Scaffold this active site. Structure first.
Site, PDB file in Angstrom:
ATOM      1  N   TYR A  69       0.841  -1.227   0.000  1.00 27.13           N
ATOM      2  CA  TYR A  69       0.000   0.000   0.000  1.00 27.13           C
ATOM      3  C   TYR A  69       0.870   1.269   0.000  1.00 27.13           C
ATOM      4  O   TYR A  69       0.333   2.334  -0.359  1.00 27.13           O
ATOM      5  CB  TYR A  69      -1.067  -0.112   1.095  1.00 27.13           C
ATOM      6  CG  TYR A  69      -2.184  -1.055   0.720  1.00 27.13           C
ATOM      7  CD1 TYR A  69      -3.017  -0.764  -0.360  1.00 27.13           C
ATOM      8  CD2 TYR A  69      -2.381  -2.255   1.392  1.00 27.13           C
ATOM      9  CE1 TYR A  69      -4.030  -1.623  -0.757  1.00 27.13           C
ATOM     10  CE2 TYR A  69      -3.403  -3.119   1.019  1.00 27.13           C
ATOM     11  CZ  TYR A  69      -4.225  -2.803  -0.062  1.00 27.13           C
ATOM     12  OH  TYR A  69      -5.240  -3.610  -0.485  1.00 27.13           O
TER      13      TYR A  69
ATOM     14  N   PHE B  71     -10.833  -3.010  10.407  1.00 30.10           N
ATOM     15  CA  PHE B  71     -11.916  -2.979   9.394  1.00 30.10           C
ATOM     16  C   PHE B  71     -11.309  -3.392   8.046  1.00 30.10           C
ATOM     17  O   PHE B  71     -12.041  -3.700   7.123  1.00 30.10           O
ATOM     18  CB  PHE B  71     -12.575  -1.595   9.384  1.00 30.10           C
ATOM     19  CG  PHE B  71     -11.628  -0.494   8.981  1.00 30.10           C
ATOM     20  CD1 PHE B  71     -11.376  -0.244   7.640  1.00 30.10           C
ATOM     21  CD2 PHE B  71     -10.946   0.243   9.933  1.00 30.10           C
ATOM     22  CE1 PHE B  71     -10.478   0.734   7.259  1.00 30.10           C
ATOM     23  CE2 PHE B  71     -10.053   1.225   9.546  1.00 30.10           C
ATOM     24  CZ  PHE B  71      -9.818   1.466   8.211  1.00 30.10           C
TER      25      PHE B  71
HETATM   26  N1  LIG Z   1     -14.650  -4.440   6.175  1.00 30.37           N
HETATM   27  C1  LIG Z   1     -15.072  -5.670   6.787  1.00 30.37           C
HETATM   28  N2  LIG Z   1     -14.478  -6.115   7.884  1.00 30.37           N
HETATM   29  C2  LIG Z   1     -14.832  -7.236   8.515  1.00 30.37           C
HETATM   30  S1  LIG Z   1     -13.881  -7.667  10.045  1.00 30.37           S
HETATM   31  C3  LIG Z   1     -12.088  -7.186  10.006  1.00 30.37           C
HETATM   32  C4  LIG Z   1     -11.263  -8.106   9.054  1.00 30.37           C
HETATM   33  C5  LIG Z   1      -9.697  -8.016   9.141  1.00 30.37           C
HETATM   34  N3  LIG Z   1      -9.151  -7.689   8.082  1.00 30.37           N
HETATM   35  C6  LIG Z   1      -8.347  -8.758   7.511  1.00 30.37           C
HETATM   36  C7  LIG Z   1      -7.486  -8.345   6.291  1.00 30.37           C
HETATM   37  C8  LIG Z   1      -6.770  -7.092   6.442  1.00 30.37           C
HETATM   38  C9  LIG Z   1      -7.611  -6.039   6.957  1.00 30.37           C
HETATM   39  C10 LIG Z   1      -8.408  -6.448   8.210  1.00 30.37           C
HETATM   40  N4  LIG Z   1     -15.841  -7.983   8.043  1.00 30.37           N
HETATM   41  C11 LIG Z   1     -16.504  -7.608   6.901  1.00 30.37           C
HETATM   42  S2  LIG Z   1     -17.784  -8.265   5.997  1.00 30.37           S
HETATM   43  C12 LIG Z   1     -17.930  -7.116   4.757  1.00 30.37           C
HETATM   44  C13 LIG Z   1     -16.952  -6.096   4.969  1.00 30.37           C
HETATM   45  C14 LIG Z   1     -16.130  -6.427   6.242  1.00 30.37           C
HETATM   46  C15 LIG Z   1     -16.771  -4.875   4.041  1.00 30.37           C
HETATM   47  C16 LIG Z   1     -18.066  -4.143   3.738  1.00 30.37           C
HETATM   48  C17 LIG Z   1     -18.912  -4.846   2.697  1.00 30.37           C
HETATM   49  C18 LIG Z   1     -19.763  -5.927   3.329  1.00 30.37           C
HETATM   50  C19 LIG Z   1     -18.952  -7.189   3.590  1.00 30.37           C
END
Ligand SMILES: Nc1nc(SCCCN2CCCCC2)nc2sc3c(c12)CCCCC3
Ligand SMILES: Nc1nc(SCCCN2CCCCC2)nc2sc3c(c12)CCCCC3
Ligand SMILES: Nc1nc(SCCCN2CCCCC2)nc2sc3c(c12)CCCCC3
Ligand SMILES: Nc1nc(SCCCN2CCCCC2)nc2sc3c(c12)CCCCC3
Ligand SMILES: [Cl-]
Ligand SMILES: [Cl-]
Ligand SMILES: [Cl-]
Ligand SMILES: [Cl-]
Ligand code: NA
Ligand code: NA
Ligand code: NA
Ligand code: NA
EC number: 2.3.1.-
Lengths: 396, 396, 396, 396
Positions: free
Chosen positions: B120, B396
Site C-alpha cells: 500500500y 476494518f
Molecule cells: N470491512 C469488513 N471487515 C470485517 S472484520 C475485520 C477483518 C480483518 N481484516 C483482515 C485483512 C486485512 C484487513 C483487516 N468484516 C466484513 S464483511 C464485509 C466487509 C467487512 C466490508 C463491507 C462490505 C460488506 C462485507
C-alpha cells in the site's frame, strides 16, 4: 558475616562464586582485562567468618548523555550472593556500601545491566535504554527507491577480518560513542577481549566477519546451530549513508534466510525497505539501568530540548532532596529549596527519564511520577526528550 | 475486463471472492452489518467479460486525530483480486478509481488495515499506528507501591456478561474514541457484531467475559487451545485509575499463567509492576495505514504541540502539491506556494507522521523525508508529536 | 467362530466394529452410498457364537490399466478384526473366502488401499502406484519462460463453488480416468459424497473451492489449523495446457505461503518453475495395491511398450501357474506350459509390475524376481513400462 | 572490476570470501587437497580495483555415463560473489569466462552441485541425478524370505575402523564408479580427506565405523545430537548380495531406532523388507547438475537402450546447434544439419536427460522439450533411459 574490600587472597574465592553465579563466565584469563577498570576500593566481599558468600564491585566508565556530555559513571557488575546465603540482606548491605563509596568518590551517576527486572528498582536504579531485536527475512528484503547508496559503480563497504582492522573499528566507535546518548568509552583491554571472541571456538561460536565503511562497521557471525541465521553482534554507524550501505551489504548475505540484530527502538532500518514489516521486532528488554547519585549535578550536566520555552518548577526526589528546577535554552539550573513540590518521583524514575528513553507522561500515567499540572508534564516530556535517540553501548 | 459500481446481482460473486481471499470471512450474515457503512458508489468490481475477478470498497468512518479533532475518513476494505487474474494491474485500476471518488466526495484522509506491509506504500498509504502485544506472566506480577487502587475496602471493578451491559460499554468507548488519536466511531451494527462474537462457538472461540469499571472495560476470553492463556480482545480506559483497576482484576485471574493484549507502545502497564520485564513485548506490527487525500485540509485540521515556538517552512509532497506551512499556538496554516521546497517527502511518509506514531527524524535518517536543515527537523518532530499517545481502535 | 455373508441384522454390529477400527468413519449416513458398490455376497462377517468380531467386503470397480484398457476390479475395503480377537487367523480366513468368491465371479484383479505396509504382501497384493506429496513455497514460485499459458489476455481458469459445476467435474474426471492407468470409474453416489465434503463443517474442515478449466479442475481448501497452507484434495487435468493453467491459478493464491498436493512421481509441476527445488517432495507412500487373480487374463488384457521387439519367455508365479509369455506389437499371449521357468516371482511382485510403477530390474536386485538372463530383465522392464505415467484415482 | 586468473597472492583473499560464503568451509588445510584437482587457468577471480569480490573455478573430474563410458568433466566449484557486490553481473561474467576455457580445453560436459535450484538453469545446467533420503525405523525391520544372505553359518560382513582398510574401500569404490552412471573417480587426496573426517571431532561429529564386505562397504556414524539415529554417509555395493548383506548388518545396529541414508530413487532396500513402507523417503533434491559443452561429442559418447529399434530425427538445442540424430544398436551418430527441427529444447534440458534421471515425456509435458510427434517422444524416452540406475558419487 563481615563486609570488607577484597585482598588478593579473596579473588580465587570470588571467581568460584562468579563461576557458580554467572553462566557466561569466561574464566580468570579475561577477568584480568575487566579487573583493570575496577578502582582501588571499587570492590566489596562478604565472608562467612573463611569463604566468600557475597561480592559486588563498580568499574570506572564514561557515559555519554544528551547534549553530547560525557559523565564519569560507576558501572556496577560482578554482583553475586552465594545460594547458601539468600534472604540474609547481603545484596542490600553490599549495595549500601558501594553507593556510599561511589557518592563520596564524586560520581554523579551509577549504571548496571540487570539479570532480572525486579531487583534494582528498590536500590534507586531505573531502566534508561531499551534493547530492541530486529529479525529481517532478507530473501524478501528490497531497498526503497529513496534509500541512499543504490547508485551504479563500486560499493564503499568491504568484507574484512576484524583483527586486521582494529585501528579503524576503534576510531569509528570512538566517534560513535561521543555523539550518541548511552555511548560508553571502550578501553584498549575491552578491544583485546572483543577481537579474541571474533575467532571461531572448538564446539563454540563460529568465526566473526566485519563489513567496514569509512563511517561505520558491522561485526556478525553465523548462528552456532541455525546455519541460515546471521547474528549482527555490533553495528556502529556515524552517518545515515554508512548505516544504509552496511545494511545493503548484510541483505547481500545470500546464503542466509534471516539477519538479527539487537538495536534501539528508533533504528531507521524498517524505513529503508519497501516492506517495513520485514524488519520484525522479535524481542524487547531493558538495557542500561541508571541510578542518579547526585540529583543537581546530573540534571545540570545534560542538555535539554531547545524547542520548549523557559519554565521553572519544584522537583522532589523521594529521600533524594527537593530542588527549584529552571530549564531554558537547553540548559538546567537545579538549586536547593523548601518551596512546595510541584513534581514528586522515586530516584529510579529519574534514572528512567534521564537519557530520554521513557516519557514523563507514560511514567505519570502509572503514578510513578506525581504532579497536578498537565502543562508541566508536557513541558518535562519535551525538555527531557533526546534529539539523538538513546542506544545501548556494550554489556558490563 | 470492465471496472463498475456493483449492482445487487454482483454481490453473491463478491462474497465468493471474499470467501476465497479472506480466511476470517464470517459469511453474508455479518456482511449485512458492514454493508451499511458503505455509501452509494463506495464499491468497485472488475468483471471478466460474467464473474467478479476484482473488488474494492470504502466505508464512511470518523477518525480522531491529535487535538481531539474528528475527520470524515474513507475506510478501504474488502480489497481482493482473483488468484486467476494476478499481475494484471487490477489493484492499481481499482485503487485509482476509489481514490478519485474519495477525493471528489471531500474526504481529507483515507485509511486501511494491510494484509501485507509491501502493497500500500506505492498507493500513498503510510503506517500511522503501531500494534504492540504485551504478554504478562501473571504468576510473578506484583503491583508497585505507587500504583493506584491498592487500598483496603471494595473493588470498583465487576465481572459481568458483555451482552447484559451493552449501554455502559458503548458509553465508555464513545468517551474513549473522542479523546484518543486513532479512535473510530463504532456504529450500532458493529456493537451488534462485537456482542455476537462474545458468546462461545461450537468447536470455536470460548465465552468472552467483561471486567467493568465506571471509566473503563476489558473484554477477554481464554485461548481455544492454550487453557492457561487469557486474551484481552479489547481494553478501553478513560482514566489512569480505571486502567490500573482493570489490570489488578486481570492479574487476579489466578487460574491463568499468562495475560496477552494487543495495545500501543506507550501502554503504562509495565510501570504498574515492581518488575517492568514481566510485561514482555511478544509481537509488533503496523496497525492503521493513512493516505492523506487533501494535504492542506489534513495539516490544517489537526492540533500541534504548544511547546514548539512559531515557525514557517515550505513542504513539498511528491505529486501532492507544494505548500507554505506555518505552525504556531498548536495550529497550522497551509497555503499554495511556488517558493523553493525546504522539506520533501512522498505522500505515504506524511500519513506515517500525521498521528505522531513515527518521528520525522527517524524517517529523515532513512531518507524518506529530505531537508538540509536539522533545526527544521527537530521543529517538525516536536510539532507533529501527539500529547495523548496514538492507539488503534478496531480492524476494518 | 463361523464365517458367513452378513444379513441386514449384522450391519449395526459391523458399523460398531468400523467405528472402533477406522478413525475416519463418517457414520452410517455415507455408509449407504458406499454400500451400493458392494454386490450380493460381496461381504463376509465372523460372529463369536452373538456379536461381529471380523468383517471384510469387496466393491465392484472399473480400473484403467496400460493401453487405456478398463478391467472389472474387486475393491477390498471395510476389513477389520475386533481388538478382542487378534492373532486368531480371522483376516486369513476372511481373505481366503473373499478371494474364492472374487475368482469364481470372474474378476481378473483385486485391489485395496493398505492401512499398514506389512499386512497384504502375504495374501498376494503388491503396491502398484506411488503417492507423492509436493509442497510448493508459492511466494518464490516463478513460471519458466517455456511454460504454457503465460501470454496476455484473459485466463481460461475460473474460481467456482464445486456444487454449482458438478456436471463439468464429472465429465472432465470421466475423460481423465479412461486415459490414465490407475484411473477408477467414480459412480454418482461417490460424487454425492465428494460434493457433501466440499462445504465447511462446524469445528471441522473449511469450505472447498474449485478452479475450473475446459480440460481440468483442482479442488482445494485451506488447512484447518495452518491458515497459510492450501491443500489440493484433487487435481484432474486431461491436457498439459490445463495442468499448467490450473497451477498458475494455485500459485496465484497470494494469501497462502504453501500449496501441497498428493500426486504421482512423474508430475511435471517442478519443471514448470524456474527453480525445480521449490516443489519439495514432503511425503511418499504406496497408493493402490493389486492382487492378480487370473495371471493369463491380466497379462493378456493390458498393452505393452511398442519400442521393445517381439520376445518369448516362461514366467512362473509361485502357486499361480507357469506360462509361455510372448510379447510383441504391444500385445501379450500367455498360455499354459510345463517348459522350464526363465522368470520366477511371488504373485504380489506381479501386481507391483502390472501398472508400470516399479521396474523389474529394481525388484530383481532385491531377489523378489528371479532370472539368470539380464537381457530378459531389460526386455521385461521396457515392455511392462507405461507410456502414460500411473496415477492413483481415489481411496476406497 | 577486472576478471583474471588468480596468482598465489590472491588465494588468502579467496579463502576469506569462501569462509564468508560457505558455512562448511574446513579451512586452508583441506583446501590444499582440493586445489590439486584445479588445472592451471582453472580459476577466475574478480578484484574491485585490492580485494577479491568474486571467484569461480573448475576441477578435472572423470564422470561415468550410460554404457560404462568415462568422460573428462569440468567440475565447477568454489563459486562465490561478495555480499557487497550482488546484482552486478559478476556470476554471469565469471561463468561466461570459465565456460569459454572449459570448451576450448576440449571438455564435452561440465558439472556442479547447486546451493540453490534457481541459479544454474540459465547458464545451461540441468539437474541430472536425484538425491533420495531413506529413513528406516529398524526396530520393525524384518527381511523378506526372498532376500539374499539369510542362511545359517558366518556373516560375510565385518565391523572395522575405516583408516585400517583404506586399500579395500578404494578398490571397491573404483569398481563401483566405473560401472555406475554418475560415478566419479576419487583421487588419493580425497581419500586422505574422507578418512580424516572418519575420526571424532571435539564438540563435532562422532567416530565413523565401517561395515566391510568383499564386494561393498558402508561408512556410518551416530548423529551428533540424536543418539538413536545412525547416518550412513556412504554405501558402495558392486553386487546385490553385498547390498543386502550390508543392510542386514545396518538393521543389526540394535541400539539405534532409525538408519538414514542419502541414496537414489531406484535403491532396492524397500523391497528387501516384508514392509516396504518402513523405508520412508524423508527428503528429495537435485544432486549433480550437467551442462553439455559439445552436443555432438556428448550424445555420441554415451550408450543407448538396445531395446528401441533404429530411428533418426533432427534435434535443435537453443543456441547450441541443430543436428541429425540417428540412434540404433545402442549407439548414436550426431551430425550438423539445416533440415527442419523435429525436437527443440534448451541446453539445460539435454543435461537433465543425459544420465537418464528424467524422462523426455515428463520434460515434454512441461513444454521444456517441444516436438509434434508422440512416437518420437516415446522413442527418446526409451533410448536415453539408463539400464543401470543413475547414482550421485560425492559432492564437490
Ligand atoms: N470491512 C469488513 N471487515 C470485517 S472484520 C475485520 C477483518 C480483518 N481484516 C483482515 C485483512 C486485512 C484487513 C483487516 N468484516 C466484513 S464483511 C464485509 C466487509 C467487512 C466490508 C463491507 C462490505 C460488506 C462485507
Ligand atoms: N563486568 C564484567 N563483565 C564481563 S562481560 C558482560 C556479562 C553480562 N552480564 C551478565 C549478567 C547481567 C549483567 C551483564 N566479564 C567480566 S569478568 C570480571 C568482570 C566482568 C568484573 C570486573 C572484575 C574482574 C572480573
Ligand atoms: N470402502 C469405504 N470407504 C470409505 S472412504 C476411504 C477410507 C480410507 N481408507 C482408510 C483405511 C485404509 C484404506 C482407505 N467409506 C466407507 S463407508 C462403507 C465403506 C467405505 C465400505 C462399503 C460398505 C459400506 C460402508
Ligand atoms: N570444491 C571443494 N569442495 C569441498 S567439499 C563439498 C562442499 C559442498 N558444497 C556446498 C555448496 C554447494 C556445492 C557443494 N571443499 C573444498 S576446499 C576448496 C575447494 C573445495 C575447491 C578447490 C579449490 C581449493 C579450495
Ligand atoms: Cl543499540
Ligand atoms: Cl491499542
Ligand atoms: Cl495422483
Ligand atoms: Cl546415491
Ligand atoms: Na528509504
Ligand atoms: Na505504578
Ligand atoms: Na516449463
Ligand atoms: Na527381497
Amino acid at each position: 558475616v563481615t563486609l570488607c574490600s577484597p585482598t588478593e587472597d579473596d579473588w580465587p574465592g570470588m571467581f568460584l562464586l562468579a563461576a557458580a553465579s554467572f553462566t557466561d563466565f569466561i574464566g580468570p584469563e579475561s577477568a584480568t582485562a575487566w579487573r583493570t577498570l575496577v578502582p582501588t576500593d571499587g570492590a566489596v566481599v562478604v565472608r562467612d567468618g573463611s569463604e566468600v558468600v557475597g561480592m559486588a564491585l563498580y568499574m570506572d566508565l564514561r557515559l555519554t548523555v544528551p547534549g553530547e556530555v560525557v559523565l564519569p559513571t560507576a558501572g556496577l557488575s560482578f554482583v553475586a550472593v552465594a545460594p547458601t546465603h539468600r534472604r540474609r540482606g547481603l545484596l542490600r548491605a553490599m549495595c549500601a556500601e558501594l553507593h556510599r563509596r561511589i557518592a563520596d568518590s564524586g560520581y554523579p551517576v551509577a549504571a548496571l545491566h540487570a539479570s532480572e527486572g525486579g531487583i534494582y528498582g528498590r536500590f534507586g536504579y531505573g531502566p534508561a535504554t531499551t534493547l530492541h531485536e530486529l529479525t529481517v527475512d532478507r530473501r524478501f528484503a528490497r531497498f526503497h527507491a529513496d534509500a541512499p547508496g543504490g547508485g551504479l559503480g563500486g560499493s564503499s563497504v568491504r568484507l574484512v577480518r576484524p583483527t586486521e582492522h582494529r585501528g579503524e573499528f576503534e576510531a569509528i566507535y570512538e566517534r560513535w560513542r561521543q555523539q550518541v546518548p548511552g555511548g560508553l568509552l571502550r578501553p584498549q583491554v575491552l578491544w583485546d577481549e572483543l577481537l579474541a571472541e571474533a575467532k571461531a571456538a572448538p564446539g563454540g561460536d563460529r568465526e566473526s566477519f566485519a563489513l567496514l565503511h569509512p563511517d561505520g562497521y558491522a561485526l556478525y557471525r553465523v548462528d552456532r546451530t541455525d546455519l541460515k541465521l546471521a547474528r549482527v553482534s555490533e553495528l556502529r554507524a556515524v552517518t545515515a549513508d554508512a548505516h544504509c550501505a552496511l545494511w545493503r551489504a548484510l541483505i547481500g548475505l545470500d546464503s542466509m534466510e534471516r539477519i538479527s540484530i539487537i538495536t534501539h527502538p528508533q533504528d531507521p532500518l524498517p524505513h529503508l525497505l519497501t516492506d517495513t514489516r520485514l524488519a520484525r521486532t522479535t524481542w524487547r528488554q531493558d538495557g542500561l539501568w541508571l541510578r542518579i547519585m547526585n540529583v543537581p549535578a546530573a540534571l545540570e550536566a545534560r542538555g535539554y530540548a531547545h524547542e520548549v520555552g523557559e519554565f521553572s518548577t519544584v522537583l522532589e526526589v523521594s529521600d533524594g532532596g527537593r530542588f527549584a528546577l529552571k530549564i531554558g535554552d537547553g540548559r538546567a539550573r537545579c538549586t536547593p529549596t523548601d518551596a512546595a513540590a510541584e513534581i514528586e518521583m522515586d530516584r529510579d524514575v529519574l534514572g528512567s527519564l534521564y537519557l530520554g528513553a521513557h516519557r514523563a507522561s507514560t511514567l505519570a500515567a502509572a503514578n510513578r511520577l506525581r504532579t497536578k499540572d498537565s502543562q508541566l508534564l508536557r513541558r518535562l516530556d519535551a525538555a527531557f526528550a533526546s534529539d539523538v535517540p538513546v542506544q545501548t553501548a556494550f554489556e558490563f
